[PDB]
Structure 1
Amino acid sequence: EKASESYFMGQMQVARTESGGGLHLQLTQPRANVDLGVGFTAAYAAAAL
C-alpha cells in the first residue's frame, strides 16, 4: 500500500583502518523500520512455476 511502513535513514559513519599495506575503511548507515498499518498492509501470491 501507499504508506506501507515508516523508514528512518540514519547518518553515515566510517571506520578508518589499515591492513597489510592498504587502507581498508568501511561504510555504515544504521536504519529502522516500523509498519504504520493496523491489520495487514501487504499481500503476495504465487503466480507462475
Structure 2
Amino acid sequence: ARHETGGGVNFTLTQPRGNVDLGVGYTAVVATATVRNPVTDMGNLPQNF
C-alpha cells in the first residue's frame, strides 16, 4: 500500500493472519516466579471528593 506525504512517499506492508486453538482443554501454563518493581509507590494519598 502506497501513501503520499509532502515529506516523502510511504510504503506500508501488511500481512493478514489467523489463529486456531487446537487443543481441547489446557495446553499452556503461565508460571509467576520473581518480582522486580513496585511501580506503584506505597506512599500516602488522600482521595479528594
Is TM (by shorter chain) over 0.5? yes
Match of 1:28 among 6, 9, 14: 14
Task: After superposition, give the CA deviation of every residue in 1:1-49 in whole Å (9 maximum; x if it has no partner).
Answer: xxxxxxxxxxxxxx11211141111010000111100111101111111
Match of 1:37 in 2: 23
Pair member with larger Rg: 2
* Structure 2: distance between partners of 1:21 and 1:45: 47
Report the TM-score when normalising by structure 1.
Answer: 0.62
- The alignment partner of 2:13 has SS state of strand
Structure 1: 5+ residue stretches without partners: 1-14
Size of the alignment, in residue pairs?
Answer: 35
Taking only aligned residues, the RMSD between alpha carbons, in angstroms, comes to 1.1
Report the TM-score when normalising by structure 2.
Answer: 0.62
- Report percent identity of matched pairs: 63
- The alignment partner of 1:24 has SS state of strand
Greater fraction of residues in strand: 1
Opposite residue 12 of structure 2, the aligned amino acid is: Q
* Structure 1: distance between partners of 2:25 and 2:3: 46
